[PDB]
Unconditional design. Structure first.
Ligand SMILES: [Cl-]
Ligand SMILES: [Cl-]
Ligand SMILES: [Zn+2]
Length: 315
């Protein structure tokens, strides 16, 4: 006796593909790798409770390949398997509202993701892939499981791995509309003279070397090919924020002088991130945990600042 049920397959959870499945065969035998809200059902035979349900499958024909690219903006063949693997964990995480923002209760080394999510809610940023637009909208409303699983997939990180906030933000910014962001730098060597550089997009909003936006405007010392130290300073900035990053070092955050910051305690192999936000006072959001202080000092790795337009007074 042949038994069948109707199910739907998808790559984006919007466009559905009607399937009739033989209840005598695994999902794997019929569709290849198959997932039900993140759970791998490849080796499971259809249940009666499955009728009418939506299953994710890998893009295995031209229609799904186009749908997957249009939704995620990636053709990485392992992407949906990585997204589903992460989602099976992130759907069990807790997303408390802390000081009016969606955070993440600590689990599975997810401190870097909490501080990234908190930062995103404080800066002006629009994502390009519909997957991130839709998932980020849900995250802002408090249901961040899809958004967190997408960040893990886009960053090639598995649940439990040690992430870096700077690297995570770089991936998210690659998938954001930063096209009108512009930065002009001048590099002055007492031997070699002056050289101006223009940076656009993600490179216009990220700097690695100093946490202080004010120091970057005054000048920072960098190597020159001649062997001397040159001075690099900000000539012009057009962006709605900037991110200043450096290896973790004891640093004092002053209320009203920055938007938010990431603190990292530990070493190259394991550690813990916290988030500091400057509002009516300094709030330290540590997943579900919240403390406040008038002053803050700690091993800061990243600081975000509000911007619109800046032009140097240096000649
Ligand atoms: Cl689809
Ligand atoms: Cl968006
Ligand atoms: Zn030089």
């Amino acid at each position: 006796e042949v038994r069948t049920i109707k199910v739907f397959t998808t790559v984006d959870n919007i466009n559905l593909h009607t399937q009739v499945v033989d209840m005598s065969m695994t999902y794997g035998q019929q569709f290849g790798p198959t997932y039900l809200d993140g759970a791998d059902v490849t080796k499971i035979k259809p249940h009666n409770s499955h009728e009418g349900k939506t299953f994710y499958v890998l893009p295995n024909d031209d229609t799904l390949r186009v749908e997957a690219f249009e939704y995620y903006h990636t053709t990485d063949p392992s992407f949906l398997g990585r997204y589903m693997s992460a989602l099976n964990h992130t759907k069990k995480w807790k997303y408390p509202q802390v000081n009016g923002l969606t955070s993440i209760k600590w689990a599975d080394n997810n401190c870097y993701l909490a501080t990234a999510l908190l930062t995103l809610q404080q800066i002006e940023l629009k994502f390009n892939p519909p997957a991130l637009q839709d998932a980020y909208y849900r995250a802002r409303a408090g249901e961040a499981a899809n958004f967190c699983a997408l960040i893990l997939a886009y960053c090639n990180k598995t649940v439990g791995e040690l992430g870096d906030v700077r690297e995570t933000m770089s991936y998210l910014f690659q998938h954001a509309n930063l096209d009108s962001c512009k930065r002009v730098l001048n590099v002055v060597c007492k031997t070699c003279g002056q050289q101006q550089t223009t940076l656009k997009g993600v490179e216009a909003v990220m700097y690695m070397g100093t946490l202080s936006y004010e120091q970057f405007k005054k000048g920072v010392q960098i190597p020159c090919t001649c062997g001397k130290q040159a001075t690099k300073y900000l000539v012009q900035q057009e962006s709605p924020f900037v991110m200043m990053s450096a290896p973790p070092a004891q640093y004092e955050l002053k209320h009203g002088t920055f938007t938010c910051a990431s603190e990292y305690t530990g070493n190259y192999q394991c550690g813990h991130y916290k988030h500091i936000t400057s509002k009516e006072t300094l709030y330290c959001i540590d997943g579900a945990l919240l403390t406040k202080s008038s002053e803050y000092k700690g091993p800061i790795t990243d600081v975000f600042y509000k911007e619109n337009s800046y032009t140097t007074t240096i000649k």
